[PDB]
Amino acid sequence: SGFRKMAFPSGKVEGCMVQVTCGTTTLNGLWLDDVVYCPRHVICTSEDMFNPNYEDLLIRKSNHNFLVQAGNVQLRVIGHSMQNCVLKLKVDTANPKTPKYKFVRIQPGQTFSVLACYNGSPSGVYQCAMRPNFTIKGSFLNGSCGSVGFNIDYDCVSFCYMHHMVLPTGVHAGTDLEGNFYGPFVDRQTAQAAGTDTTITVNVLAWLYAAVINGDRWFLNRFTTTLNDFNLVAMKYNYEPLTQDHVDILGPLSAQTGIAVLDMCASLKELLQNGMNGRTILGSALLEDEFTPFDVVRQCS
Amino acid sequence: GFRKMAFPSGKVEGCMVQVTCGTTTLNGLWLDDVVYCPRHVICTSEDMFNPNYEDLLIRKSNHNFLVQAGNVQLRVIGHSMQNCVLKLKVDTANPKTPKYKFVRIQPGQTFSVLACYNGSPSGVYQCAMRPNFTIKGSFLNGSCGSVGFNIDYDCVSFCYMHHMVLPTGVHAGTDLEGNFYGPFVDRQTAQAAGTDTTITVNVLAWLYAAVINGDRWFLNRFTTTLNDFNLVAMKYNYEPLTQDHVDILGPLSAQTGIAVLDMCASLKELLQNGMNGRTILGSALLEDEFTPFDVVRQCS
Ligand SMILES: Cn1cnc(Cn2c(=O)nc(Nc3cc4cn(C)nc4cc3Cl)n(Cc3cc(F)c(F)cc3F)c2=O)n1
Ligand SMILES: Cn1cnc(Cn2c(=O)nc(Nc3cc4cn(C)nc4cc3Cl)n(Cc3cc(F)c(F)cc3F)c2=O)n1
Ligand SMILES: [Cl-]
Ligand SMILES: [Cl-]
Ligand SMILES: [Mg+2]
Ligand SMILES: [Mg+2]
C-alpha cells in the first residue's frame, strides 16, 4: 500500500565516501579496495577552473599533493592516474567496507539513487532518473562534486553516476565511473546549457500502472490504441516513443492489473490532450516519469 | 531543484534484525544489547483479530523469541513489554550502534523511513506525520517493525515504528516507547483515521521556498492575525498553525524579510481566490510535505 519515490539503502556506499583535497580545492571521492575515484576537477585552482589543461595539470602533481581523509583519518596516496574525467588515486590501505560492486553506464530513462555528500560526509539520499537530455534533476549544493549515483542488485552495488557540476537551469551534469560525461558537457567552469528535454513515456505508463494498483483509476477508459498511433501523439507532446521492448517490459504490470499496455496508452493519450481537469494521480498534478517499470514492480512486490 | 531527500540510511541499516515467534515474523531494531519490535509478533494467526497481550506474553519465555541479524542468531536473555513495543535483551551489544535517542514527533514533521522485509532493508524514503496521525507511506506485507528516523549530525533520532495498514491504505505506528500515534490499537481490525487536513506550516515553508527562488507573484501587502488565519484555515480543511510552527518559520521569515503573518495573508488570499491558472515552483498544487527545516536543509 502507498507509493513513494524510494531510493536504495545507502549504507553500502556511505562506507566508501571520503574527502579529496588538492591545494585549496576539495570534493568527495569514492574509496573502493585501494583506489579512490573522484572528479579530476579537484586538481584545478581558481585560475585553472575556467579552461583547464588537465593533462599538464596532472603531470605537475605528485602523490604528496593529494590529501585523502576517511573520517578523521588520512590515507596515503601512493599513485595517481587519470581516466577521462575521473581521477584515480591509489592508497596504501584497502577499504575494509568495500561492497561487491561494478561500474555501469546507464541509459536515458533509467533511475538510480544519489548519495549527496559534502566534504566526504553523506548528507542525503534520493532517487533520480537520467533525463533524455542527459542531465539529472538532482538536489545538490556547493561541495557536492564527487557524489555518486548507484543501484543495488541483491548484494552488488552498480555505480553509474559521479556528480560534477550544476547547469544554469538548475539541473546537473556528471559522468559514469569511467569518466565519460553523460551528454555534451565538459568539466570546465563555464555556463553550459542542455538540449531540450523530453518525457520518459515508458516510465509514465509504469507510474499509471502504479496508480491503478493503489486504487487510483479515474483516468482509465474503455479504449485501446495502436503503438504507432500512440507514438504519433506522444512525439507531438515531446514524449519519448514507446518501443516494443517497452511494451514487453511493462508486461508484469499489465498482467498484474489486467490492463493491456495499449489500453493504458489510450488513457495517457487522453491525459495529454485533455489534461487532468483539476484531478490528481497519486497525489500529483503532473505526470511522473522518474519511475521505471522495474521500480514499480520492485515497490509493488 | 527540489527533491524529497531522505537521510542516509546506513546508521539504521546496521541495526535492523528479524524477530520471529513461532511462524509470526517481523522486523526489529537492535541498539546496544536490546532489540525493539512490535508486540504483535507474539500473536498467532487466530490471535491477531483480538489479542490478549498480557495472556500471550505470560506464556512466552526468552527461548520462544528468534532474533536474527542476517543469518546470525542473537540469543534472547530477557524480555519486557512497554506499551505496544516488545523489548528483548540479547547477549550481544550491537557494535554498529550509533549515537541515538528516542523522540515522539509532532503532527506535520517529516522523517526518513527505512523499509525492511525479513530484517533486510529494501528502500528509504521521506514522509510526514499527517495531522490525523497516519503516514502516507509505502509498505508491503512483512514491513511491520520498520522504523522512521531523523539524523542530526551524528545522532539518530528514532521517531516511528511501523505497525499496520489502515483500510484507506495509509499507515499507523508507534514511537519507540510503544505509544501509538493517533487513536489506533494494535489489532487486526479495520480502523478508520480522522479526516486528514493540509499541513499549513509546510505549505508556508514551500511558499517561502518559492520566494527564495524568485517566485513571488502571490505576495500581497496585507497581514493578518494568527487567530483570524487559523479560523479561516479550518474552513478550507487546513491545519491550524501552532506557536511551534510560527517559531520554525522564523529563519525563512528572516531570510526573505517577509513576516510570518504577512505570508499567512498571502496564503489566505490563495485559498479564497485560487491560483487563477498560475503555478508556484512550477506546480499547480501546494506541497505540504516539505518542512521549514527541509527547505533550510536543501536550500543552503
Ligand atoms: C551549487 N552546486 C550544485 N552542484 C554543485 C557541484 N559543484 C561543486 O560542488 N563544486 C564545484 N566547483 C568547485 C569549487 C571549489 C572551491 N573549492 C575550494 N573547492 C572546490 C571544488 C569544486 Cl569541484 N562546481 C563547479 C564545477 C565543478 C566541476 F567538477 C566542473 F568540471 C566544472 C564546474 F564548473 C560544482 O558544480 N554546486
Ligand atoms: C500490506 N501492508 C502494508 N503494511 C503492512 C504492515 N503489516 C505487516 O507487515 N504485517 C501485518 N501482520 C502480520 C502478519 C503476519 C504473518 N506472519 C507469518 N507473520 C506476520 C506478522 C505480522 Cl506483523 N500487518 C497487520 C497488522 C500488524 C500489526 F502490527 C497490528 F497491530 C495489526 C495488524 F492488523 C501489517 O499491517 N502490510
Ligand atoms: Cl562553454
Ligand atoms: Cl497575532
Ligand atoms: Mg483504455
Ligand atoms: Mg501578505
Side-chain angles (χ1 to χ4, degrees), chain A residues 5-26:
Chain A
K5 226 173 188 60
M6 222 176 64
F8 292 99
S10 59
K12 288 177 170 56
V13 181
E14 293 170 47
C16 300
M17 301 309 298
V18 304
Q19 184 174 194
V20 181
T21 302
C22 186
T24 53
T25 311
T26 187

Side-chain angles (χ1 to χ4, degrees), chain A residues 1-11 14 122-128 137-139 141 280 285-286 290 299 301, chain B residues 3-10 13 122-127 136-140 165 169 171 285 289 297-298 300:
Chain A
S1 54
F3 201 77
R4 286 278 187 182
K5 226 173 188 60
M6 222 176 64
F8 292 99
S10 59
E14 293 170 47
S123 168
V125 60
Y126 53 85
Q127 189 78 346
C128 281
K137 296 168 136 67
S139 181
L141 299 180
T280 59
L286 302 169
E290 301 213 345
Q299 178 172 166
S301 294
Chain B
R3 282 236 186 271
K4 269 177 163 48
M5 195 163 56
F7 284 102
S9 59
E13 293 168 54
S122 169
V124 61
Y125 55 86
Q126 189 78 346
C127 69
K136 294 168 135 67
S138 180
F139 288 120
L140 299 181
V165 57
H171 307 102
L285 302 169
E289 298 213 345
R297 172 167 172 245
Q298 297 201 37
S300 295

